[PDB]
Amino acid sequence: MKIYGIYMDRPLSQEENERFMTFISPEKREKCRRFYHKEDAHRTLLGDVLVRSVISRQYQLDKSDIRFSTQEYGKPCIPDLPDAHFNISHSGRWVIGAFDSQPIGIDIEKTKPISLEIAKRFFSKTEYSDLLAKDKDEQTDYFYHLWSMKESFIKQEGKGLSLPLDSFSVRLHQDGQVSIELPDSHSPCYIKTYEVDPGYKMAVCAAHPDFPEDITMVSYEELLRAAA
Ligand SMILES: CC(C)(COP(=O)(O)OP(=O)(O)OC[C@H]1O[C@@H](n2cnc3c(N)ncnc32)[C@H](O)[C@@H]1OP(=O)(O)O)[C@@H](O)C(=O)NCCC(=O)NCCS
Numbered sequence: 589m590k591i592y593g594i595y596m597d598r599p600l601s602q603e604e605n606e607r608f609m610t611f612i613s614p615e616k617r618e619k620c621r622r623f624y625h626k627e628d629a630h631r632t633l634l635g636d637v638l639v640r641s642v643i644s645r646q647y648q649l650d651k652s653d654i655r656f657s658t659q660e661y662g663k664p665c666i667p668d669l670p671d672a673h674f675n676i677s678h679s680g681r682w683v684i685g686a687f688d689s690q691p692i693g694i695d696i697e698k699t700k701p702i703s704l705e706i707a708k709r710f711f712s713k714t715e716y717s718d719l720l721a722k723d724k725d726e727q728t729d730y731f732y733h734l735w736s737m738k739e740s741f742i743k744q745e746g747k748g749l750s751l752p753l754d755s756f757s758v759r760l761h762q763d764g765q766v767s768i769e770l771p772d773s774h775s776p777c778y779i780k781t782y783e784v785d786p787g788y789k790m791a792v793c794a795a796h797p798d799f800p801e802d803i804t805m806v807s808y809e810e811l812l813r814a815a816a
């Protein structure tokens with residue numbers, strides 16, 4: 589497992605953005621072109637180029653070579669490289685990607701004024717009440733702490749928001765109370781949170797507990813490199 593990060597200490601220059609657009613598919617350039625805000629385009633663009641750069645290098649291929657596809661619920665993958673699993677998350681000045689030989693999920697969030705939504709429908713009565721329990725100055729960070737962890741799980745599973753697969757078992761406790769057991773004990777996942785910037789919350793969800801101690805930082809200059 590390896591985690592790479594790109595911190596946009598400065599936006600991409602006119603030329604840098606044109607150079608990177610050159611590595612992606614026509615469909616991706618259109619999607620990038622369509623964003624109202626250039627910083628959303630820059631995040632999607634860099635996330636795409638980071639994956640191309642990391643995986644192509646792993647298989648001595650050219651970034652341009654990679655061909656992406658989308659699984660059933662939209663999770664990206666590279667069909668011709670089945671064991672090169674990855675996941676991207678980007679928020680604010682951060683674009684981060686996790687790579688593993690098994691399904692992986694990652695999430696980074698710029699911390700900002702919370703909104704009851706997601707917090708009401710995406711947070712349990714439990715997570716929600718816990719949150720409102722935090723003091724006002726700790727609510728924003730706590731919200732994103734829980735959310736980054738929760739979304740890393742959902743992004744790792746890939747199956748969207750509705751565990752349909754035979755991924756759960758009904759367990760009965762005292763007086764017949766049910767507890768749903770998930771994930772299946774034989775399909776465990778683990779989460780590790782990383783402190784990369786105080787204005788952000790980040791979490792990785794992997795199929796094994798072997799998380800790298802550090803994230804490898806990549807610059808625009810390293811991503812633009814040819815490296816045959
Ligand atoms: C899970 C989801 C809500 C994440 O949103 P987010 O919190 O805004 O954004 P993050 O920065 O954490 O992550 C975005 C990336 O996650 C990845 N991603 C997309 N769908 C994903 C999914 N179902 N599971 C895991 N990762 C996914 C992508 O690489 C995307 O990067 P990009 O948008 O620049 O191409 C969203 O990715 C999703 O569910 N997409 C499904 C889309 C689909 O199947 N069809 C679109 C039909 S209109």
Ligand SMILES: [Mg+2]
Nearest residue numbers: 677695696739
């Ligand atoms: Mg997110």
